[PDB]
Every structure is written in structure tokens, then in C-alpha cells.
Design a protein around this ligand. Structure first.
Ligand SMILES: Cc1ccc(/C=N\O)cc1C(=O)N[C@H](C)c1cccc2ccccc12
Ligand SMILES: [Cl-]
Ligand SMILES: [Cl-]
Ligand SMILES: [Cl-]
Ligand SMILES: [Zn+2]
Ligand SMILES: [Zn+2]
Ligand SMILES: [Zn+2]
Ligand SMILES: [Zn+2]
Length: 313
């Protein structure tokens, strides 16, 4: 028998000594086995594998519990989807642009670069240790793992056309936004006045307008009575808000927002860029950087800082 030694893991924290037969495939002995993203199930051990760390699909209770504790999912496809993504994201370039980890354009990743840039500018704690650890590494310039995890958590494959607002919504659902509270008042001439409290993701995301100020003053929405009613923001408790609308020409003013998603072209197959408010306006286009004191262009998301807001109405 001819047998190198390896470590198996689901989380790359808890490592298990295995001694593998070199005649038999990884698949025969562990089930689905991966190396640095690369599916090696049907391959047999090369000598240069000695003492390396393979990811395996959980196949005992120990590994299922470890996988849930690390990823916060029992989805048996999760590991394979994560590894398939990582196989690409480890080949992407992550240049520092204006002090932020960006992504050089590849594999339709403009939406992922825009999300990654945004996440470095808002306050968020991820529930899954996998996401938290990778977010810290990405902020320090090593974003491959974080990008692979984002794809796996959003049910996206490399090359798939992604929406930044949907991606942020999925990420927010994996974050601690419990303290986040939104109180709305709705005013109809007929049904009258109704207040509702939103919590978590629904407290920090709105679709319909880019302007936080315009949200505070009120926006026109349909009432169930059939009339148009006024929805306005009573109370906001969150470290940020995300205001989205279908793309449209919008003016961004230095110092009045944190950052924004620019989107150019047709539904689904357009291109995102990222606008950030520093000492002036920076436009991050993957590896490309431009700056200007003023900006007008097609915006679909705007992010703003918050802590505690109460209306004067
Ligand atoms: C880029 C993208 C990827 C996937 C999806 C939805 N399903 O797969 C959608 C978009 C999208 O076009 N989002 C932009 C920001 C968008 C969002 C909302 C309305 C839009 C109307 C016209 C053009 C673009 C519009
Ligand atoms: Cl493990
Ligand atoms: Cl969970
Ligand atoms: Cl979670
Ligand atoms: Zn273990
Ligand atoms: Zn969780
Ligand atoms: Zn690729
Ligand atoms: Zn009504």
C-alpha cells in the first residue's frame, strides 16, 4: 500500500489527518474532494499532495456540524458552488483603488466589484464566520475567498449577470441587522394614517427613490382604498440606508452620500461602476479610477450614513 498523508476539512480550521491510498481516487475514499477550488474527486494522489489541506463534502455528523457552524447552511451543493466560484475568483486581480480593494474586470464581475467596494464603506457584521473572516481578508486586499462566498451565498455562478441591490439584500440577510428599525407613517385622505415598524433588511433597503431626503419628506404610493397615499420616514435606527430605483439620470453631490451604483445599458446585460464621496467624487470602474468635483449619470443605488433619525412632523 502506497499512502501520502493529507488534512480534510469543511471550514479550513478543524483539520483531520487522513492517510490516502495512491491507487484510489480522492472520490473513492472521501467523496467529493477539492483543492484550492479545483475539483480533484476523480483524480488520485500525486506525491506533491503530502500534508496539503483538501475540502471534503461533509459525510459524518462532526463535519455537518462544523460546516453549519462555519457557513450557516446545510445546503449540500454549497461547498461545490463555493469551490467552482473560487477556481475563478483566485485568478482575478484585486487592485487597491483610492484605498479600497476593487476587482479588475473579468467574467461579468462589475456587480461583484461594486458590492465589494460598497461593503468596505458601510458598517456590517456577518453572522457566518466564513463570511466575517473572508470580509476581513478582503478589506486587507485578499478578496478571492470573499468573492467566491458572495457568489455561493447569492446562488450565482461566475459569468452570471448579477444585480447589486439583490446581492446586497442577500448579504444583509446574512448580517446582524436586528437592532435596525424603520418606522413609516402612511397618510391617505380616506383610510387615514397608519404607522408600521420594519426590522432587519427591510429597515435598511427601500426601492422607489434614490433620495434619503425625499423619503423623509414623503413619497406618493398606492393605497389599498384605491387612492394615492404619502409614505414618509418617522424613525430610522441603522448605521446606513440603501435607497434604490430603476436607473435614471441623477446628480451626486460631494459630501451628501457615502457611495452609489452607476448602471449603464440594457436591463440585465449592462455595466456597473461605483461612485464614492471622499474629498472629491471618485468613479471606480474595476481597476480604472476617474475623479470629478461634480457628477450626473445613471444611478440605481445610493448608500447614506445613519445612526438615529426622528422626523419633525
Ligand atoms: C444587472 C441585472 C442583473 C439581473 C437582474 C434581474 N434578474 O436577473 C437585473 C439587473 C438589472 O438590470 N438591474 C438594474 C439596476 C435595473 C434594476 C431595476 C430596473 C431596471 C430597469 C431597466 C434597466 C435596469 C434596471
Ligand atoms: Cl472541518
Ligand atoms: Cl443561519
Ligand atoms: Cl446567516
Ligand atoms: Zn472535525
Ligand atoms: Zn446564520
Ligand atoms: Zn473565469
Ligand atoms: Zn385609503
Amino acid at each position: 500500500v502506497r499512502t501520502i498523508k493529507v488534512f480534510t476539512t469543511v471550514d479550513n480550521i478543524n483539520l483531520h489527518t487522513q492517510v490516502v491510498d495512491m491507487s484510489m481516487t480522492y472520490g473513492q475514499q472521501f467523496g467529493p474532494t477539492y483543492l484550492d477550488g479545483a475539483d480533484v474527486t476523480k483524480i488520485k494522489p500525486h506525491n506533491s499532495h503530502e500534508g496539503k489541506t483538501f475540502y471534503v463534502l461533509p459525510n459524518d455528523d462532526t463535519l455537518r456540524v462544523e460546516a453549519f457552524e462555519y457557513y450557516h447552511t446545510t445546503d449540500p451543493s454549497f461547498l461545490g458552488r463555493y469551490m467552482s466560484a473560487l477556481n475563478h475568483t483566485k485568478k482575478w486581480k484585486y487592485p487597491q483603488v483610492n484605498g479600497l480593494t476593487s476587482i479588475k474586470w473579468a467574467d461579468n464581475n462589475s456587480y461583484l466589484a461594486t458590492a465589494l467596494l460598497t461593503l468596505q464603506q458601510i458598517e456590517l457584521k456577518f453572522n457566518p464566520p466564513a463570511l466575517q473572516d473572508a470580509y476581513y481578508r478582503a478589506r486587507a486586499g485578499e478578496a478571492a475567498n470573499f468573492c467566491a462566498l458572495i457568489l455561493a451565498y447569492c446562488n450565482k455562478t461566475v459569468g452570471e449577470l448579477g444585480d447589486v441591490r439583490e446581492t446586497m439584500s442577500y448579504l444583509f440577510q446574512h448580517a446582524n441587522l436586528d437592532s435596525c428599525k424603520r418606522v413609516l407613517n402612511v397618510v391617505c385622505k380616506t383610510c387615514g394614517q397608519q404607522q408600521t415598524t420594519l426590522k432587519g433588511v427591510e429597515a435598511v433597503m427601500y426601492m422607489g427613490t434614490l433620495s434619503y431626503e425625499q423619503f423623509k419628506k414623503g413619497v406618493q404610493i398606492p393605497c389599498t382604498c384605491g387612492k394615492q397615499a404619502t409614505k414618509y420616514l418617522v424613525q430610522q435606527e441603522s448605521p446606513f440606508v440603501m435607497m434604490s430605483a430603476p436607473p435614471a439620470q441623477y446628480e451626486l453631490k460631494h459630501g451628501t452620500f457615502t457611495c452609489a451604483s452607476e448602471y449603464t445599458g440594457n436591463y440585465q446585460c449592462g455595466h456597473y461602476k461605483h461612485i464614492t464621496s471622499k474629498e472629491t467624487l471618485y468613479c471606480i470602474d474595476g481597476a480604472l479610477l476617474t475623479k470629478s468635483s461634480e457628477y450626473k449619470g445613471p444611478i440605481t443605488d445610493v448608500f447614506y450614513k445613519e445612526n438615529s433619525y426622528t422626523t419633525t412632523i
